[PDB]
From a paper:
Two plasmid-encoded dihydrofolate reductase (DHFR) isoforms, DfrA1 and DfrA5, that give rise to high levels of resistance in Gram-negative bacteria were structurally and biochemically characterized to reveal the mechanism of TMP resistance and to support phylogenic groupings for drug development against antibiotic resistant pathogens. TMP is a selective inhibitor of bacterial dihydrofolate reductase (DHFR), which catalyzes the NADPH-dependent reduction of dihydrofolate (DHF) to tetrahydrofolate (THF), a necessary step for the recycling of reduced folate cofactors. Trimethoprim resistance in Enterobacteriaceae occurs almost exclusively through the acquisition of plasmid-associated dfr genes that encode intrinsically insensitive DHFR enzymes. Expectedly, all three enzymes form the stereotypical DHFR fold with an eight-stranded β-sheet, four α-helices (B, C, E, and F) and three catalytic loops (the Met20, F-G, and G-H loops).
Crystal structures of EcDHFR:TMP and EcDHFR:NADPH:TMP, determined to 2.5 Å, and 3.0 Å respectively, show that the binding affinity of TMP is driven by electrostatic interactions between the protonated diaminopyrimidine ring and Asp27 as well as van der Waals contacts between the trimethoxyphenyl ring and helices B and C (specifically, the side chains of Leu28, Phe31, and Ile50). Furthermore, the antifolate adopts a nearly identical conformation when overlaid with chromosomal DHFRs from other prokaryotic species, including Gram-negative (Coxiella burnetii)57 and Gram-positive (Staphylococcus aureus)46 organisms. In EcDHFR, Asp27 forms a critical electrostatic interaction with the basic headgroup of dihydrofolate-competitive inhibitors. Specifically, the EcDHFR:TMP complex displayed a stabilizing shift of 13.9 °C compared to the apo form.
Residue numbers in the entry:
A (entry chain A), B (entry chain A): 1 to 159
Amino acid sequence: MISLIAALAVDRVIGMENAMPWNLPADLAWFKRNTLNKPVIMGRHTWESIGRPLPGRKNIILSSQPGTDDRVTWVKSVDEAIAACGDVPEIMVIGGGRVYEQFLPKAQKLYLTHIDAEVEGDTHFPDYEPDDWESVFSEFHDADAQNSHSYCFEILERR
Amino acid sequence: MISLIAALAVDRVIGMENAMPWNLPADLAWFKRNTLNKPVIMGRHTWESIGRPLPGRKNIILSSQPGTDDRVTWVKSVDEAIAACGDVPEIMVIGGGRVYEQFLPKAQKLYLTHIDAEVEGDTHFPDYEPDDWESVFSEFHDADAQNSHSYCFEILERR
Ligand SMILES: COc1cc(Cc2cnc(N)nc2N)cc(OC)c1OC
Ligand SMILES: COc1cc(Cc2cnc(N)nc2N)cc(OC)c1OC
């Protein structure tokens, strides 16, 4: 099935700028934990922004432009992206905003990190209509030495 | 013992403006649940802002000015406020920022609502040094019909 995994600042803002509120080591450990040994689909900006292949995962870049790295798979369509995942229990869509948009209607599961931090972004995680989605897990953490804002992991399943 | 209970927007902003992010019915049910059959200490602005006595609780207003309502107790000092609570298991300090400030060093427990909402306030909940405080409970809720932002209840105990 298709899952989206995303880090949200307040007002559901997202961004892939390296250091920021998107550098939270705890968010990156949670990302790693929930994507290892799964295919990841990402848009080109998310690929540029991570700037290396994610090891232990098949990396699929959805882009209208031709590929510039042979260590990952490049595709032009959401159907091509899905087909390149093969027969697997779970496909992980890892951003950015355009990619989240085109995969949400097909997704059955959301892994969200609510980061208790203010960013101006103008680029938002898409509108998951609460009537369509059931929260099944949440886990709050305080700010600590490594993690300079509080955050909350949430998993939602589609009804 | 002395507890603080407070609603925080991002950056630990607080405010007592009626409708706002401080109108969250769920935050008000949680406030009621955790303060019923306890004394409440508040500053004058919090008293003006609530604009009625809280029933089922002894209401103590800490103010340098003389009292203007006989249904509540008025005092001039934190010691006077504490003494007017009598022998009770738990004293609840309900704001505002000046009152939170002068009671934090004496508090052993914090009831915080983290509201996932942006407000400009310039008036902040005080710095609870994470090394002094242990989170023992947290409970995330999604935005719903009644509650127009996600929120998280947290209880911390002093080490
Ligand atoms: C693995 O490294 C990164 C991964 C991501 C995507 C991402 C990060 N966190 C969460 N929860 N969901 C995601 N989709 C974003 C990044 O930039 C902030 C990364 O930089 C290290
Ligand atoms: C009982 O009514 C109110 C109470 C408060 C204080 C308050 C409200 N919520 C929380 N969690 N802590 C508090 N100290 C603040 C208020 O204004 C927003 C109230 O208006 C109804």
